[PDB]
Design a protein around this nucleic acid. Sequence first.
RNA 1: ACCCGGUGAAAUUGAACUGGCCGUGAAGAUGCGGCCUACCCGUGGCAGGACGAAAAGACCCCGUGGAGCUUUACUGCAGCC
RNA 2: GGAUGACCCCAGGCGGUAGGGGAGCGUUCCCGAUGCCGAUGAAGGCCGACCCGCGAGGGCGGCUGGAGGUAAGGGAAGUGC
RNA 3: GCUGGGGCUAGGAGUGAAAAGCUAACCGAGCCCGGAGAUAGCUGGUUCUCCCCGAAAUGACUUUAGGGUCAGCCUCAGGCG
RNA 4: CUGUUGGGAAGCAGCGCCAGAGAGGGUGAAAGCCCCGUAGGCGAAAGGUGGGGGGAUAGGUGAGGGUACCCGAGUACCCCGUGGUUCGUGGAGCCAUGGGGGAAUCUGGGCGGACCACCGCCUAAGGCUAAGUACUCCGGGUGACCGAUAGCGCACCAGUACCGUGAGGGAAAGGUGAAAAGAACCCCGGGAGGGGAGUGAAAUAGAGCCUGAAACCGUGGGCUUACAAGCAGUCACGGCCCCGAGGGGUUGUGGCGUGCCUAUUGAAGCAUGAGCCGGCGACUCACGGUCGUGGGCGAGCUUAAGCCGUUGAGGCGGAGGCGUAGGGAAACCGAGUCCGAACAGGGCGCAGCGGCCGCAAAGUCCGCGGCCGUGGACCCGAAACCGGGC
RNA 5: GGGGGGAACCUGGGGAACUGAAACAUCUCAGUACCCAGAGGAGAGGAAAGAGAAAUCGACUCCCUGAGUAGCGGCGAGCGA
Lengths: 64, 107, 149, 49
Amino acid sequence: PKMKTHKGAKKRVKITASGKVVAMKTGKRHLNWQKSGKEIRQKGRKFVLAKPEAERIKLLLPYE
Amino acid sequence: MRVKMHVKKGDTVLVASGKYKGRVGKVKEVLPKKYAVIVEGVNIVKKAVRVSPKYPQGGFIEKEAPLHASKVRPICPACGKPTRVRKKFLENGKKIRVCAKCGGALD
Amino acid sequence: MKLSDLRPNPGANKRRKRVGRGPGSGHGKTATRGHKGQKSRSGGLKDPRRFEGGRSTTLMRLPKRGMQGQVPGEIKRPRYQGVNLKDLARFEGEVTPELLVRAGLLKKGYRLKILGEGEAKPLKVVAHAFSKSALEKLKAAGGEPVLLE
Amino acid sequence: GNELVRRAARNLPWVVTLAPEGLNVYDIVRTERLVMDLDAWEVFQNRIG
RNA sequence: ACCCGGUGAAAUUGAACUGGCCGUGAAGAUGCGGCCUACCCGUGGCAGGACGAAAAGACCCCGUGGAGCUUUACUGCAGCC
RNA sequence: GGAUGACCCCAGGCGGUAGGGGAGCGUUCCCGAUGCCGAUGAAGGCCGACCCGCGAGGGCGGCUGGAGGUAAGGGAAGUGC
RNA sequence: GCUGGGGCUAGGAGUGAAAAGCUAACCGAGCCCGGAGAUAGCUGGUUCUCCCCGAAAUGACUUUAGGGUCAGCCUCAGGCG
RNA sequence: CUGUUGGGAAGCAGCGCCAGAGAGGGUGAAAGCCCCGUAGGCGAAAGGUGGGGGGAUAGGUGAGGGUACCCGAGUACCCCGUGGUUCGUGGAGCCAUGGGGGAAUCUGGGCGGACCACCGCCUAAGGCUAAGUACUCCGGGUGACCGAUAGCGCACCAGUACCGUGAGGGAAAGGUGAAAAGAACCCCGGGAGGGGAGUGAAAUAGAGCCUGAAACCGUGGGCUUACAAGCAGUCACGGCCCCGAGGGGUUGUGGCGUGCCUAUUGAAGCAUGAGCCGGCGACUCACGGUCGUGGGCGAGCUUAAGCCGUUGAGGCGGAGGCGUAGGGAAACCGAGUCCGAACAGGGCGCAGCGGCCGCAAAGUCCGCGGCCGUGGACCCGAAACCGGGC
RNA sequence: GGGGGGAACCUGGGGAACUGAAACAUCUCAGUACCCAGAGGAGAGGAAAGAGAAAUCGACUCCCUGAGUAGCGGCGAGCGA
Ligand SMILES: [Mg+2]
Ligand SMILES: [Mg+2]
Ligand SMILES: [Mg+2]
Ligand SMILES: [Mg+2]
Ligand SMILES: [Mg+2]
Ligand SMILES: [Mg+2]
Ligand SMILES: [Mg+2]
Ligand SMILES: [Mg+2]
Ligand SMILES: [Mg+2]
Ligand SMILES: [Mg+2]
Ligand SMILES: [Mg+2]
Ligand SMILES: [Mg+2]
Ligand SMILES: [Mg+2]
Ligand SMILES: [Mg+2]
Ligand SMILES: [Mg+2]
Ligand SMILES: [Mg+2]
Ligand SMILES: [Mg+2]
Ligand SMILES: [Mg+2]
Ligand SMILES: [Mg+2]
Ligand SMILES: [Mg+2]
Ligand SMILES: [Mg+2]
Ligand SMILES: [Mg+2]
Ligand SMILES: [Mg+2]
Ligand SMILES: [Mg+2]
Ligand SMILES: [Mg+2]
Ligand SMILES: [Mg+2]
Ligand SMILES: [Mg+2]
Ligand SMILES: [Mg+2]
Ligand SMILES: [Mg+2]
Ligand SMILES: [Mg+2]
Ligand SMILES: [Mg+2]
Ligand SMILES: [Mg+2]
Ligand SMILES: [Mg+2]
Ligand SMILES: [Mg+2]
Ligand SMILES: [Mg+2]
Ligand SMILES: [Mg+2]
Ligand SMILES: [Mg+2]
Ligand SMILES: [Mg+2]
Ligand SMILES: [Mg+2]
Ligand SMILES: [Mg+2]
Ligand SMILES: [Mg+2]
Ligand SMILES: [Mg+2]
Ligand SMILES: [Mg+2]
Ligand SMILES: [Mg+2]
Ligand SMILES: [Mg+2]
Ligand SMILES: [Mg+2]
Ligand SMILES: [Mg+2]
Ligand SMILES: [Mg+2]
Ligand SMILES: [Mg+2]
Ligand SMILES: [Mg+2]
Ligand SMILES: [Mg+2]
Ligand SMILES: [Mg+2]
Ligand SMILES: [Mg+2]
Ligand SMILES: [Mg+2]
Ligand SMILES: [Mg+2]
Ligand SMILES: [Mg+2]
Ligand SMILES: [Mg+2]
Ligand SMILES: [Mg+2]
Ligand SMILES: [Mg+2]
Ligand SMILES: [Mg+2]
Ligand SMILES: [Mg+2]
Ligand SMILES: [Mg+2]
Ligand SMILES: [Mg+2]
Ligand SMILES: [Mg+2]
Ligand SMILES: [Mg+2]
Ligand SMILES: [Mg+2]
Ligand SMILES: [Mg+2]
Ligand SMILES: [Mg+2]
Ligand SMILES: [Mg+2]
Ligand SMILES: [Mg+2]
Ligand SMILES: [Mg+2]
Ligand SMILES: [Mg+2]
Ligand SMILES: [Mg+2]
Ligand SMILES: [Mg+2]
Ligand SMILES: [Mg+2]
Ligand SMILES: [Mg+2]
Ligand SMILES: [Mg+2]
Ligand SMILES: [Mg+2]
Ligand SMILES: [Mg+2]
Ligand SMILES: [Mg+2]
Ligand SMILES: [Mg+2]
Ligand SMILES: [Mg+2]
Ligand SMILES: [Mg+2]
Ligand SMILES: [Mg+2]
Ligand SMILES: [Mg+2]
Ligand SMILES: [Mg+2]
Ligand SMILES: [Mg+2]
Ligand SMILES: [Mg+2]
Ligand SMILES: [Mg+2]
Ligand SMILES: [Mg+2]
Ligand SMILES: [Mg+2]
Ligand SMILES: [Mg+2]
Ligand SMILES: [Mg+2]
Ligand SMILES: [Mg+2]
Ligand SMILES: [Mg+2]
Ligand SMILES: [Mg+2]
Ligand SMILES: [Mg+2]
Ligand SMILES: [Mg+2]
Ligand SMILES: [Mg+2]
Ligand SMILES: [Mg+2]
Ligand SMILES: [Mg+2]
Ligand SMILES: [Mg+2]
Ligand SMILES: [Mg+2]
Ligand SMILES: [Mg+2]
Ligand SMILES: [Mg+2]
Ligand SMILES: [Mg+2]
Ligand SMILES: [Mg+2]
Ligand SMILES: [Mg+2]
Ligand SMILES: [Mg+2]
Ligand SMILES: [Mg+2]
Ligand SMILES: [Mg+2]
Ligand SMILES: [Mg+2]
Ligand SMILES: [Mg+2]
Ligand SMILES: [Mg+2]
Ligand SMILES: [Mg+2]
Ligand SMILES: [Mg+2]
Ligand SMILES: [Mg+2]
Ligand SMILES: [Mg+2]
Ligand SMILES: [Mg+2]
Ligand SMILES: [Mg+2]
Ligand SMILES: [Mg+2]
Ligand SMILES: [Mg+2]
Ligand SMILES: [Mg+2]
Ligand SMILES: [Mg+2]
Ligand SMILES: [Mg+2]
Ligand SMILES: [Mg+2]
Ligand SMILES: [Mg+2]
Ligand SMILES: [Mg+2]
Ligand SMILES: [Mg+2]
Ligand SMILES: [Mg+2]
Ligand SMILES: [Mg+2]
Ligand SMILES: [Mg+2]
Ligand SMILES: [Mg+2]
Ligand SMILES: [Mg+2]
Ligand SMILES: [Mg+2]
Ligand SMILES: [Mg+2]
Ligand SMILES: [Mg+2]
Ligand SMILES: [Mg+2]
Ligand SMILES: [Mg+2]
Ligand SMILES: [Mg+2]
Ligand SMILES: [Mg+2]
Ligand SMILES: [Mg+2]
Ligand SMILES: [Mg+2]
Ligand SMILES: [Mg+2]
Ligand SMILES: [Mg+2]
Ligand SMILES: [Mg+2]
Ligand SMILES: [Mg+2]
Ligand SMILES: [Mg+2]
Ligand SMILES: [Mg+2]
Ligand SMILES: [Mg+2]
Ligand SMILES: [Mg+2]
Ligand SMILES: [Mg+2]
Ligand SMILES: [Mg+2]
Ligand SMILES: [Mg+2]
Ligand SMILES: [Mg+2]
Ligand SMILES: [Mg+2]
Ligand SMILES: [Mg+2]
Ligand SMILES: [Mg+2]
Ligand SMILES: [Mg+2]
Ligand SMILES: [Mg+2]
Ligand SMILES: [Mg+2]
Ligand SMILES: [Mg+2]
Ligand SMILES: [Mg+2]
Ligand SMILES: [Mg+2]
Ligand SMILES: [Mg+2]
Ligand SMILES: [Mg+2]
Ligand SMILES: [Mg+2]
Ligand SMILES: [Mg+2]
Ligand SMILES: [Mg+2]
Ligand SMILES: [Mg+2]
Ligand SMILES: [Mg+2]
Ligand SMILES: [Mg+2]
Ligand SMILES: [Mg+2]
Ligand SMILES: [Mg+2]
Ligand SMILES: [Mg+2]
Ligand SMILES: [Mg+2]
Ligand SMILES: [Mg+2]
Ligand SMILES: [Mg+2]
Ligand SMILES: [Mg+2]
Ligand SMILES: [Mg+2]
Ligand SMILES: [Mg+2]
Ligand SMILES: [Mg+2]
Ligand SMILES: [Mg+2]
Ligand SMILES: [Mg+2]
Ligand SMILES: [Mg+2]
Ligand SMILES: [Mg+2]
Ligand SMILES: [Mg+2]
Ligand SMILES: [Mg+2]
Ligand SMILES: [Mg+2]
Ligand SMILES: [Mg+2]
Ligand SMILES: [Mg+2]
Ligand SMILES: [Mg+2]
Ligand SMILES: [Mg+2]
Ligand SMILES: [Mg+2]
Ligand SMILES: [Mg+2]
Ligand SMILES: [Mg+2]
Ligand SMILES: [Mg+2]
Ligand SMILES: [Mg+2]
Ligand SMILES: [Mg+2]
Ligand SMILES: [Mg+2]
Ligand SMILES: [Mg+2]
Ligand SMILES: [Mg+2]
Ligand SMILES: [Mg+2]
Ligand SMILES: [Mg+2]
Ligand SMILES: [Mg+2]
Ligand SMILES: [Mg+2]
Ligand SMILES: [Mg+2]
Ligand SMILES: [Mg+2]
Ligand SMILES: [Mg+2]
Ligand SMILES: [Mg+2]
Ligand SMILES: [Mg+2]
Ligand SMILES: [Mg+2]
Ligand SMILES: [Mg+2]
Ligand SMILES: [Mg+2]
Ligand SMILES: [Mg+2]
Ligand SMILES: [Mg+2]
Ligand SMILES: [Mg+2]
Ligand SMILES: [Mg+2]
Ligand SMILES: [Mg+2]
Ligand SMILES: [Mg+2]
Ligand SMILES: [Mg+2]
Ligand SMILES: [Mg+2]
Ligand SMILES: [Mg+2]
Ligand SMILES: [Mg+2]
Ligand SMILES: [Mg+2]
Ligand SMILES: [Mg+2]
Ligand SMILES: [Mg+2]
Ligand SMILES: [Mg+2]
Ligand SMILES: [Mg+2]
Ligand SMILES: [Mg+2]
Ligand SMILES: [Mg+2]
Ligand SMILES: [Mg+2]
Ligand SMILES: [Mg+2]
Ligand SMILES: [Mg+2]
Ligand SMILES: [Mg+2]
Ligand SMILES: [Mg+2]
Ligand SMILES: [Mg+2]
Ligand SMILES: [Mg+2]
Ligand SMILES: [Mg+2]
Ligand SMILES: [Mg+2]
Ligand SMILES: [Mg+2]
Ligand SMILES: [Mg+2]
Ligand SMILES: [Mg+2]
Ligand SMILES: [Mg+2]
Ligand SMILES: [Mg+2]
Ligand SMILES: [Mg+2]
Ligand SMILES: [Mg+2]
Ligand SMILES: [Mg+2]
Ligand SMILES: [Mg+2]
Ligand SMILES: [Mg+2]
Ligand SMILES: [Mg+2]
Ligand SMILES: [Mg+2]
Ligand SMILES: [Mg+2]
Ligand SMILES: [Mg+2]
Ligand SMILES: [Mg+2]
Ligand SMILES: [Mg+2]
Ligand SMILES: [Mg+2]
Ligand SMILES: [Mg+2]
Ligand SMILES: [Mg+2]
Ligand SMILES: [Mg+2]
Ligand SMILES: [Mg+2]
Ligand SMILES: [Mg+2]
Ligand SMILES: [Mg+2]
Ligand SMILES: [Mg+2]
Ligand SMILES: [Mg+2]
Ligand SMILES: [Mg+2]
Ligand SMILES: [Mg+2]
Ligand SMILES: [Mg+2]
Ligand SMILES: [Mg+2]
Ligand SMILES: [Mg+2]
Ligand SMILES: [Mg+2]
Ligand SMILES: [Mg+2]
Ligand SMILES: [Mg+2]
Ligand SMILES: [Mg+2]
Ligand SMILES: [Mg+2]
Ligand SMILES: [Mg+2]
Ligand SMILES: [Mg+2]
Ligand SMILES: [Mg+2]
Ligand SMILES: [Mg+2]
Ligand SMILES: [Mg+2]
Ligand SMILES: [Mg+2]
Ligand SMILES: [Mg+2]
Ligand SMILES: [Mg+2]
Ligand SMILES: [Mg+2]
Ligand SMILES: [Mg+2]
Ligand SMILES: [Mg+2]
Ligand SMILES: [Mg+2]
Ligand SMILES: [Mg+2]
Ligand SMILES: [Mg+2]
Ligand SMILES: [Mg+2]
Ligand SMILES: [Mg+2]
Ligand SMILES: [Mg+2]
Ligand SMILES: [Mg+2]
Ligand SMILES: [Mg+2]
Ligand SMILES: [Mg+2]
Ligand SMILES: [Mg+2]
Ligand SMILES: [Mg+2]
Ligand SMILES: [Mg+2]
Ligand SMILES: [Mg+2]
Ligand SMILES: [Mg+2]
Ligand SMILES: [Mg+2]
Ligand SMILES: [Mg+2]
Ligand SMILES: [Mg+2]
Ligand SMILES: [Mg+2]
Ligand SMILES: [Mg+2]
Ligand SMILES: [Mg+2]
Ligand SMILES: [Mg+2]
Ligand SMILES: [Mg+2]
Ligand SMILES: [Mg+2]
Ligand SMILES: [Mg+2]
Ligand SMILES: [Mg+2]
Ligand SMILES: [Mg+2]
Ligand SMILES: [Mg+2]
Ligand SMILES: [Mg+2]
Ligand SMILES: [Mg+2]
Ligand SMILES: [Mg+2]
Ligand SMILES: [Mg+2]
Ligand SMILES: [Mg+2]
Ligand SMILES: [Mg+2]
Ligand SMILES: [Zn+2]
């Protein structure tokens, strides 16, 4: 039967126009009090997943 | 419901095929369970018999062997020719076998 | 042309790869699976798109973000699809949402919004919405924007 | 489309019979010649348009 | 038990034209090397070898295998309050 | 070179397990086939020191057999121990 | 005490002067049929031919360590030159 | 119809003929015209059906106006405990209800995802209702379905024999020939069996019957072997035998030489598996995905279920799906957008080849192929777990 | 009038586990297997105290689509209007 969309990926990740995979940076959920403004600021951005990991995630998203 | 038999005891038939092709003879017997007929004088085979009553000499007898009914064709008693069989409903309503060549009855 | 002359082009019908049918073929015995281990087995291997040998996976270590929704689900609100000016040049007189739907440009069940990529024609366009740039261009090539609902 | 014509030819071993609505390429390529009514010629033109 | 007449199994069996020593070899060789020894084929016997047969080691370990059992392991359910 | 495999010339590469790739053989079935081979002998069997093919195989001839088989080109698989 | 005949108690249940004994010739949970093609990261096995290339047994992480994910190393297609 | 070869004609040859019938099966081999059939037609006194045509019956039917009588009760409703739904306690409504409390009859009551307002929807606690849907013991039709280890477990006297106390398990086993013409009689022999005779186109078609492979056993012949050391072969030469400047069979001597498979760092290995032969025996299919590829169309491409047609004919159907725009958690904006106070910076995005004609191409559809996901998913194998019985 | 039978199909009353989550308990397998009651040539359902946002639709059943969408989910595996 037809593939099911992995909802964990769908809630974590976006496929961009040219087919990149973008996620929020990790490491600011907590324990933030002694991290610099630069570290809080820079983790506040999205980033482009390394290519092998990106292709694995894209296969979990067949109907985007 | 029945084995269709285009030939009867004991009308006259041509053996149209086989070793005895061309022979004309009387249908001695009809075997529906075998779709065969026996034709007088045709298909004579030598059967061996043990000494006994009926054959105190032993030896052999002659027997007419059966013929597959499709090798046989009635000779129409009107025109005397071998023919396929047609059906015809009489005035009373009964159906009889008639001759495809002329139209005569074959009984 | 005869029945016996009908044939596919070269490469149109390739023959299948058949494994485990002898030493000559390059695929005999192990059938290209290698030696032992999971994955050589009938049924082998967890989903390679996700599973990573027991450690936390690349996916699940990334954080969640955004509204995920909640029961009773998606909130009904008006939706917009955008059609650019350049895709209006095939049209004469007056473009409509229904006409744009017929052409294959606009999807059913989507309110119409005109966008500014391309150039404006002297057309009377009837749309639910217009970008600023799509208005100026249209209201400058002699076009007649018709906002509506 | 004339069924009397189709009934008359269909038992010849060298003839395949069709109504124009059944015109298909396999039966065309099967046969060495193509004989058509003008009424079937008309149907053919309507379908390939 | 042996011999003659009668009847006539079995596990096992890659194929075999299947010797000894001293070596070599996956580390204990009829099968490799070098030497020695040895005409062909059986019958009664003996059990040193064929890492002889039998049984996919019970010991041992391994498997995010199983089952019985225990308790102040976890979490439930009966029961009782 | 001739001119898009028309064949020739000269040159170089061509050990191989896991494994990647390419080209072929053969088996069953379908179109081809209302055809064609066939009792002046189908398939299958048994031989062969012959012919073609690198090979898987394909021919041909003799014997057996006694009623089936099936081309060029394609299609599909319960397809090779 | 032994014994015939007629009966009753059974599967997490019986029965046991207690051996986890016995419950139809293997009982730490009977048998049959079914769920069922349970599951087996284990062991075995995997069938025509020819041609070109051709590994790895490392690193990181892993209730992971004889299993995996990514990288490294092989191969094919298109591109670069 | 005839001639012909033949045991046999339907083959081959000559000359015809039918066809709304040249599907198919039989007949001594291969038949449109011999047979059974086929196309096209025809048919029920009796029983069953009758959803269709007709006829009966039951049944059915107004307006204002006033009245506020009635409109389904341990019910609604609330609370406790649960089930159902996509909803696993969640902001948890709705539908259902085991416990407790417990109404009103339209100015009544339920619902629109806690709740309240507003605005709308609907009438709970009585019942019935064809058709479109499912299934295949049964019947028929048809297969790029099987063809006796296959196909149902059973082509056959099979749920049998046999196994088990029982539930239950559960086989093997098809073919003489065109026709029995199934071999009178004689001979050896108790019989079995055979030799003759006879039949037959054929009798190693003789019933222990078509074909009749292989392992395995035997008889006869050629070459060879009793001083010889062996994975059994191979290379060379010589001798003998056979077919006719060659070839085949055989092997005396000499040279060389560690079975196959599996598993391993490493096996002839004294590590696994195999007595030997024959037959069965393992990478597939559906749907999705992802690349590549062969074609169709191209800012467009494409239908699904069904409907009509056909009876191995194809067409209709545009619902829908993919693509045409992205960015943002979102409101939203848009060739941009988001973060930001920003005209900052950054992230993610945005732009054919030849003379209007032509080729190509986004994309999309179908075919094919590689691999992935879901399914038992390459095949075989547990110890076990659960249910219902015995 | 009932009783009992009927290959599958159907409705109602009960209702597992292996397995998957590479352990496991919520979750999954699955209201599946199975037991039971009943029905019939079908069965169920069915004429709104409905849908849900259209100032709309208009019994129920069944197919396609909507859609692996909305959502649900040790927000895991998965489940899925
Ligand atoms: Mg599913
Ligand atoms: Mg999640
Ligand atoms: Mg996001
Ligand atoms: Mg954290
Ligand atoms: Mg935070
Ligand atoms: Mg802290
Ligand atoms: Mg610091
Ligand atoms: Mg700082
Ligand atoms: Mg700080
Ligand atoms: Mg920093
Ligand atoms: Mg900030
Ligand atoms: Mg790679
Ligand atoms: Mg995908
Ligand atoms: Mg994808
Ligand atoms: Mg979609
Ligand atoms: Mg008659
Ligand atoms: Mg005559
Ligand atoms: Mg006679
Ligand atoms: Mg007639
Ligand atoms: Mg009468
Ligand atoms: Mg009469
Ligand atoms: Mg008379
Ligand atoms: Mg194919
Ligand atoms: Mg394949
Ligand atoms: Mg290939
Ligand atoms: Mg091979
Ligand atoms: Mg081989
Ligand atoms: Mg290889
Ligand atoms: Mg292989
Ligand atoms: Mg092998
Ligand atoms: Mg393997
Ligand atoms: Mg491989
Ligand atoms: Mg492969
Ligand atoms: Mg593998
Ligand atoms: Mg592989
Ligand atoms: Mg392997
Ligand atoms: Mg290995
Ligand atoms: Mg390996
Ligand atoms: Mg292996
Ligand atoms: Mg491995
Ligand atoms: Mg392994
Ligand atoms: Mg491997
Ligand atoms: Mg695999
Ligand atoms: Mg791998
Ligand atoms: Mg799986
Ligand atoms: Mg597995
Ligand atoms: Mg861990
Ligand atoms: Mg959403
Ligand atoms: Mg015809
Ligand atoms: Mg015809
Ligand atoms: Mg033809
Ligand atoms: Mg035809
Ligand atoms: Mg026809
Ligand atoms: Mg016709
Ligand atoms: Mg037709
Ligand atoms: Mg032609
Ligand atoms: Mg003596
Ligand atoms: Mg003796
Ligand atoms: Mg004796
Ligand atoms: Mg005896
Ligand atoms: Mg024995
Ligand atoms: Mg040997
Ligand atoms: Mg030997
Ligand atoms: Mg010796
Ligand atoms: Mg010896
Ligand atoms: Mg010796
Ligand atoms: Mg040593
Ligand atoms: Mg030694
Ligand atoms: Mg020795
Ligand atoms: Mg040796
Ligand atoms: Mg050596
Ligand atoms: Mg030696
Ligand atoms: Mg030695
Ligand atoms: Mg030596
Ligand atoms: Mg010595
Ligand atoms: Mg003796
Ligand atoms: Mg002895
Ligand atoms: Mg002895
Ligand atoms: Mg001994
Ligand atoms: Mg001893
Ligand atoms: Mg010993
Ligand atoms: Mg040993
Ligand atoms: Mg020993
Ligand atoms: Mg041993
Ligand atoms: Mg042993
Ligand atoms: Mg023992
Ligand atoms: Mg075992
Ligand atoms: Mg062991
Ligand atoms: Mg053991
Ligand atoms: Mg122990
Ligand atoms: Mg140990
Ligand atoms: Mg253990
Ligand atoms: Mg563990
Ligand atoms: Mg482990
Ligand atoms: Mg364990
Ligand atoms: Mg346990
Ligand atoms: Mg050369
Ligand atoms: Mg070179
Ligand atoms: Mg060369
Ligand atoms: Mg090579
Ligand atoms: Mg390959
Ligand atoms: Mg077929
Ligand atoms: Mg044909
Ligand atoms: Mg001929
Ligand atoms: Mg002839
Ligand atoms: Mg055949
Ligand atoms: Mg042959
Ligand atoms: Mg070669
Ligand atoms: Mg040959
Ligand atoms: Mg000859
Ligand atoms: Mg032959
Ligand atoms: Mg025949
Ligand atoms: Mg063929
Ligand atoms: Mg061909
Ligand atoms: Mg197979
Ligand atoms: Mg093949
Ligand atoms: Mg083979
Ligand atoms: Mg007693
Ligand atoms: Mg007593
Ligand atoms: Mg007693
Ligand atoms: Mg008793
Ligand atoms: Mg008792
Ligand atoms: Mg009891
Ligand atoms: Mg028990
Ligand atoms: Mg039990
Ligand atoms: Mg006692
Ligand atoms: Mg028992
Ligand atoms: Mg027993
Ligand atoms: Mg016992
Ligand atoms: Mg015991
Ligand atoms: Mg147990
Ligand atoms: Mg148990
Ligand atoms: Mg047990
Ligand atoms: Mg017992
Ligand atoms: Mg038993
Ligand atoms: Mg059962
Ligand atoms: Mg069952
Ligand atoms: Mg299961
Ligand atoms: Mg199994
Ligand atoms: Mg397990
Ligand atoms: Mg395992
Ligand atoms: Mg095994
Ligand atoms: Mg193997
Ligand atoms: Mg290559
Ligand atoms: Mg190389
Ligand atoms: Mg290592
Ligand atoms: Mg490495
Ligand atoms: Mg390593
Ligand atoms: Mg470990
Ligand atoms: Mg260790
Ligand atoms: Mg460990
Ligand atoms: Mg390994
Ligand atoms: Mg392992
Ligand atoms: Mg890898
Ligand atoms: Mg490299
Ligand atoms: Mg690569
Ligand atoms: Mg290249
Ligand atoms: Mg280069
Ligand atoms: Mg004659
Ligand atoms: Mg004739
Ligand atoms: Mg003729
Ligand atoms: Mg016909
Ligand atoms: Mg037919
Ligand atoms: Mg016929
Ligand atoms: Mg013919
Ligand atoms: Mg015929
Ligand atoms: Mg034929
Ligand atoms: Mg015929
Ligand atoms: Mg015919
Ligand atoms: Mg008719
Ligand atoms: Mg009729
Ligand atoms: Mg009728
Ligand atoms: Mg009526
Ligand atoms: Mg009415
Ligand atoms: Mg009224
Ligand atoms: Mg009224
Ligand atoms: Mg009142
Ligand atoms: Mg009411
Ligand atoms: Mg009431
Ligand atoms: Mg109450
Ligand atoms: Mg309420
Ligand atoms: Mg409570
Ligand atoms: Mg409640
Ligand atoms: Mg639910
Ligand atoms: Mg709930
Ligand atoms: Mg719930
Ligand atoms: Mg709720
Ligand atoms: Mg309620
Ligand atoms: Mg209540
Ligand atoms: Mg009201
Ligand atoms: Mg009220
Ligand atoms: Mg309510
Ligand atoms: Mg409410
Ligand atoms: Mg509502
Ligand atoms: Mg609301
Ligand atoms: Mg409502
Ligand atoms: Mg109502
Ligand atoms: Mg009803
Ligand atoms: Mg119905
Ligand atoms: Mg049937
Ligand atoms: Mg039938
Ligand atoms: Mg077949
Ligand atoms: Mg058989
Ligand atoms: Mg059978
Ligand atoms: Mg046979
Ligand atoms: Mg078979
Ligand atoms: Mg049967
Ligand atoms: Mg049956
Ligand atoms: Mg059987
Ligand atoms: Mg029997
Ligand atoms: Mg018994
Ligand atoms: Mg027993
Ligand atoms: Mg018995
Ligand atoms: Mg049993
Ligand atoms: Mg049988
Ligand atoms: Mg036989
Ligand atoms: Mg016969
Ligand atoms: Mg004959
Ligand atoms: Mg006598
Ligand atoms: Mg006598
Ligand atoms: Mg005598
Ligand atoms: Mg005598
Ligand atoms: Mg006597
Ligand atoms: Mg006798
Ligand atoms: Mg004799
Ligand atoms: Mg005799
Ligand atoms: Mg004779
Ligand atoms: Mg004889
Ligand atoms: Mg013979
Ligand atoms: Mg014979
Ligand atoms: Mg025969
Ligand atoms: Mg025979
Ligand atoms: Mg024999
Ligand atoms: Mg023989
Ligand atoms: Mg033999
Ligand atoms: Mg002999
Ligand atoms: Mg001899
Ligand atoms: Mg001799
Ligand atoms: Mg000497
Ligand atoms: Mg000598
Ligand atoms: Mg010697
Ligand atoms: Mg010698
Ligand atoms: Mg050799
Ligand atoms: Mg030698
Ligand atoms: Mg020499
Ligand atoms: Mg010679
Ligand atoms: Mg020689
Ligand atoms: Mg000599
Ligand atoms: Mg030597
Ligand atoms: Mg050796
Ligand atoms: Mg080998
Ligand atoms: Mg091993
Ligand atoms: Mg080892
Ligand atoms: Mg290795
Ligand atoms: Mg040994
Ligand atoms: Mg050995
Ligand atoms: Mg051992
Ligand atoms: Mg060995
Ligand atoms: Mg081992
Ligand atoms: Mg092995
Ligand atoms: Mg054995
Ligand atoms: Mg044996
Ligand atoms: Mg042997
Ligand atoms: Mg074998
Ligand atoms: Mg595959
Ligand atoms: Mg399959
Ligand atoms: Mg296929
Ligand atoms: Mg596919
Ligand atoms: Mg696909
Ligand atoms: Mg694909
Ligand atoms: Mg494609
Ligand atoms: Mg197209
Ligand atoms: Mg194009
Ligand atoms: Mg968005
Ligand atoms: Mg802002
Ligand atoms: Mg800026
Ligand atoms: Mg920017
Ligand atoms: Mg940029
Ligand atoms: Mg394309
Ligand atoms: Mg893949
Ligand atoms: Mg499955
Ligand atoms: Mg399975
Ligand atoms: Mg399996
Ligand atoms: Mg697979
Ligand atoms: Mg369990
Ligand atoms: Mg358990
Ligand atoms: Mg247990
Ligand atoms: Mg029980
Ligand atoms: Mg009982
Ligand atoms: Mg009863
Ligand atoms: Mg009943
Ligand atoms: Mg049910
Ligand atoms: Mg139920
Ligand atoms: Mg139920
Ligand atoms: Mg229970
Ligand atoms: Mg469980
Ligand atoms: Mg479990
Ligand atoms: Mg599963
Ligand atoms: Mg698990
Ligand atoms: Mg697991
Ligand atoms: Mg476990
Ligand atoms: Mg579990
Ligand atoms: Mg659960
Ligand atoms: Mg399941
Ligand atoms: Mg469930
Ligand atoms: Mg069931
Ligand atoms: Mg019906
Ligand atoms: Mg009904
Ligand atoms: Mg009502
Ligand atoms: Mg509705
Ligand atoms: Mg209305
Ligand atoms: Mg209404
Ligand atoms: Mg209506
Ligand atoms: Mg959609
Ligand atoms: Mg859920
Ligand atoms: Mg789930
Ligand atoms: Mg759920
Ligand atoms: Mg569920
Ligand atoms: Mg629902
Ligand atoms: Zn006459």
